[PDB]
Fold:
Amino acid sequence: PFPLPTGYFGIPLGLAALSLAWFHLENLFPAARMVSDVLGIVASAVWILFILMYAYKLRYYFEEVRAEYHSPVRFSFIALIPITTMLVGDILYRWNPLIAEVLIWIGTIGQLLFSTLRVSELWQGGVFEQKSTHPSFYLPAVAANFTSASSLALLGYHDLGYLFFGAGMIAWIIFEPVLLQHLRISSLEPQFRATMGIVLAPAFVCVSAYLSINHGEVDTLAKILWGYGFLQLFFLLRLFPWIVEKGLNIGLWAFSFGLASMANSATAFYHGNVLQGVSIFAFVFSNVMIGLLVLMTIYKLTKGQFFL
Amino acid sequence: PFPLPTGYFGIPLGLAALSLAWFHLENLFPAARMVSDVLGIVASAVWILFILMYAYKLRYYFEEVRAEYHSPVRFSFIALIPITTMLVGDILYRWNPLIAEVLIWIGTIGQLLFSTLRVSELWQGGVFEQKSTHPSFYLPAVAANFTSASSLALLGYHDLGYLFFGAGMIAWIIFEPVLLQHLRISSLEPQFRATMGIVLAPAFVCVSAYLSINHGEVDTLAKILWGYGFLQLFFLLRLFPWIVEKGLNIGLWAFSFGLASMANSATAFYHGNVLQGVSIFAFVFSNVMIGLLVLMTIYKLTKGQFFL
Amino acid sequence: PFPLPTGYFGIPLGLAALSLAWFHLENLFPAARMVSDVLGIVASAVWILFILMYAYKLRYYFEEVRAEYHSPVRFSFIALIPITTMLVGDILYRWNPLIAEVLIWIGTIGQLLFSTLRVSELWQGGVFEQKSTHPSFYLPAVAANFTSASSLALLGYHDLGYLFFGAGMIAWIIFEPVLLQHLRISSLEPQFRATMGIVLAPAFVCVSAYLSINHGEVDTLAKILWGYGFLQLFFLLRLFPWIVEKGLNIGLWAFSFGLASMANSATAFYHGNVLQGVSIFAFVFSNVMIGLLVLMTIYKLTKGQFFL
Ligand SMILES: CCCCCCCCO[C@@H]1O[C@H](CO)[C@@H](O)[C@H](O)[C@H]1O
Ligand SMILES: CCCCCCCCO[C@@H]1O[C@H](CO)[C@@H](O)[C@H](O)[C@H]1O
Ligand SMILES: CCCCCCCCO[C@@H]1O[C@H](CO)[C@@H](O)[C@H](O)[C@H]1O
Ligand SMILES: CCCCCCCCO[C@@H]1O[C@H](CO)[C@@H](O)[C@H](O)[C@H]1O
Ligand SMILES: CCCCCCCCO[C@@H]1O[C@H](CO)[C@@H](O)[C@H](O)[C@H]1O
Ligand SMILES: CCCCCCCCO[C@@H]1O[C@H](CO)[C@@H](O)[C@H](O)[C@H]1O
Ligand SMILES: CCCCCCCCO[C@@H]1O[C@H](CO)[C@@H](O)[C@H](O)[C@H]1O
Ligand SMILES: CCCCCCCCO[C@@H]1O[C@H](CO)[C@@H](O)[C@H](O)[C@H]1O
Ligand SMILES: CCCCCCCCO[C@@H]1O[C@H](CO)[C@@H](O)[C@H](O)[C@H]1O
Ligand SMILES: CCCCCCCCO[C@@H]1O[C@H](CO)[C@@H](O)[C@H](O)[C@H]1O
Ligand SMILES: CCCCCCCCO[C@@H]1O[C@H](CO)[C@@H](O)[C@H](O)[C@H]1O
Ligand SMILES: CCCCCCCCO[C@@H]1O[C@H](CO)[C@@H](O)[C@H](O)[C@H]1O
Structure:
């Protein structure tokens, strides 16, 4: 027995999001559906296993859960649980809309309850410190709201989706200023640097949610978001040797949320006949990168260097 | 004789804004007009009294005014004077557009002069400190501009209204990041905690001004603003026991600006047939809360625990 | 021989931008074209001279260039080189679209490479300090992207222009919060205060780029940007005696980017029949101010107080 590290939910997250990106190519290239189904089944299977492992953690390692919950830094990773639950719901919708809808509401209510309890509590002061200003905060504060937005849109609740979308978008703009100033002043320590991959996520996760609500209309807002997203991509590419100064590691799955959302949004740009060449590049690049993450993870597993 | 504490202008502010919310229901439910008129008359009467009291302060307690003006924290409350003057103008417009227009211009010129003189002066450095980063700064920097926007729209100056609207909206987005980071790191002391109610205001005051200019069109921007507004509401509800740790007090009128603007915007959502159930909830909730503020204020008055 | 101070590129920048503002009045008042051509030729001639001077710096004073590049503050001024190169391209487009397009791509690729190499590197921490939080950072992070946006639109690449536009707009919103908080807390030293003129630039440079892409449609976003732009103008006017506490100096060319972009955007507002009176005022004001900068620069030159 061992306690599952919460960040491992980023693996089914990235795979699930990538499944959904391929799903959105099925009417352009029908073979995309099989790719989407295989990614979706793998993501769902991994999610089930990790949910079971985390249920075991809650039962037998509760003080570890309590400590991560109350941490002004580590609490954020818990949001991966409802995020992934909603993404698995989106996948399952293609086969069973009833079960999908249950998962989507559990993850939406769960993430909103979680932020309401913990993100707000930080405003009491004295626990969060300047050094707590980490990319992981995007998970409960931003990514969870975007994922509710797009999942609720899938279910037909577009106006409710816009409320979640706005909560995420404005929360993003209100957090990022202080994050980037912190990174400029304070060198993030190597053990946390893989989480720089979360910095890729906001603009791409935002535009993918936006396009899912707005019926895939590639408008001025969508193009604006893509532009900042690519700026951040270029910055993180330049930063990559520094990010991995102390070696490649499984934490690099942090990049997969933004990469998969870049792929998803590319499908909508392509469908809309906007920047189709960029779209192709983006879709291929993100798939190659996630493919590399998969190969490195299989390798770690075959060495027995995966679970703590 | 006594010097009137400037924050007491939040009382006619909240009542005036709530009058205007009811006004906007009159064609759906005609009895709303009487409710609006009674709220409006009470707000206007209280405003007249407080303006007279503040004129007395200026004449006989000028050094107290000077000290609050030059304070990098306390100066903000002075913006309540022009804000309330414009809101009373909006109320009076239903009876006398000439007098209303005079009040609206006095409050617009007054607030813009005030910010131009004081908000900019802070950028000289060395007076404002990290500890000066309080919710009250929203008053001169954000709320005053939104109130000019909607008042100018009432008078038919929609494009000028958009200039004020943009000044407020961008000023909001540019201040809030550093406010929330400050609250996370530094516990706000109990004596200032009621001012956390001002954190409710931006998104709701923003959307209410937006809808007043844009002829009540409930569009993507409006829905985005409502979503972040509700996020902040939920956070402040969770925080409420901490806010009132040292007891209930008259400072809780700080919440009334955001509550009344939530009510006002709800009327527009309802008229637009967007999220009508949410709209009803919001309108009823804000009225109940402001009603409780009124009952607690009457009680303080009947104990002689109102004026210093 | 002497090493050219990099900030002097602000002179051809301001003149070039002002040339383009006049260009956009030619169909309303045909004599505007001659004014535009004279400004454009002067700006281009000064640019050629300064590029040659900087090429000499690179050849014979390389360690000075290296030190400014690696400085977390001084690196920003280098972005003036590609910015001005693109603006000269926009001017030359009226006579030779082929040469113009070459300059526009050199400046676009150059600025994007520059930011990708240096702006991102700051996120490694430990070099940039709180005291490095200067208005000049807008140059690589914001202004360069807006200038690419509008230049690419000139060439017909509107959707690519929107990507650059979004990169600039979101980068602006994400930097300004921490800049203004820094200015409030820390008094900027006199020797840097002229750079407060760069604070005028974002909203005006943003709206001018937006209007250049969107085919001159003066919409809600444009009006919002103008409103915040004018707020900042009023604040900087109030601050001007403090800015020039230690005397008038050539650094005041910092204001010319925002002033010229206010003029440019005014032409579009005027064409769109939005706030035409404000438009006239803005256009005349910015021209008078830049005219004063020119007269003061001629005077410095005639005293031999221009080049180091
Ligand atoms: C994803 C699930 C995370 C849940 C973490 C909940 C942490 C609650 O935390 C604990 O709850 C205890 C009661 O059991 C209280 O006695 C403790 O004071 C409190 O710290
Ligand atoms: C992801 C699903 C939501 C997790 C809900 C766990 C409920 C947390 O519970 C509460 O959080 C508070 C801290 O904010 C503590 O004061 C309480 O002791 C704790 O029980
Ligand atoms: C954080 C940055 C927010 C940018 C918001 C851009 C506003 C969207 O821009 C609007 O989009 C519409 C559809 O494309 C256009 O028709 C409008 O004219 C345009 O202003
Ligand atoms: C998100 C982008 C993924 C879409 C992959 C598109 C690859 C198809 O390639 C495109 O096929 C078209 C016909 O179908 C041709 O007209 C184009 O020239 C070709 O580039
Ligand atoms: C709402 C009204 C607030 C006005 C406060 C103005 C504060 C001006 O302040 C004082 O003005 C004096 C002249 O009377 C000067 O001698 C002082 O230096 C200056 O501090
Ligand atoms: C709400 C109506 C606007 C109030 C106008 C009061 C004018 C303030 O006046 C000035 O403010 C400056 C500080 O910025 C001081 O330098 C001056 O001494 C003071 O007179
Ligand atoms: C701080 C966040 C700003 C969000 C801006 C949202 C841009 C408004 O969004 C625009 O609104 C129009 C009317 O609903 C739509 O038709 C446009 O397509 C949509 O982008
Ligand atoms: C801002 C929201 C305030 C509006 C209050 C609406 C309360 C009216 O209630 C509504 O009345 C309708 C007919 O008028 C019915 O069709 C609806 O079922 C009912 O909910
Ligand atoms: C506008 C042009 C600015 C270019 C500045 C480049 C600064 C590069 O800097 C230097 O490059 C040297 C190689 O020449 C290396 O040996 C040094 O380590 C590096 O500091
Ligand atoms: C304005 C045109 C772009 C200038 C390109 C100069 C290339 C800078 O070059 C590199 O920058 C790095 C710092 O980020 C250093 O590590 C390298 O030593 C240096 O060569
Ligand atoms: C940082 C602030 C961003 C503000 C974004 C405003 C969104 C643009 O606003 C949109 O513009 C369209 C064209 O005018 C309108 O038709 C839309 O209804 C309006 O929401
Ligand atoms: C950017 C603003 C620059 C445009 C300068 C406009 C000055 C023209 O002036 C305008 O001329 C019109 C006829 O042409 C008249 O109808 C108007 O009354 C007059 O104000």
Summary: Residues A 65-66, 69, 78 surround octyl beta-D-glucopyranoside (ligand 1) (CB under 6 Å). Residues 32-60 of chain A form the longest helix (29 residues). Chain A touches chain C at residues 173, 176-178, 180-181, 183-188, 196, 203, 220, 223-228, 230-231, 234-239, 242, 274-275 (CB under 8 Å).
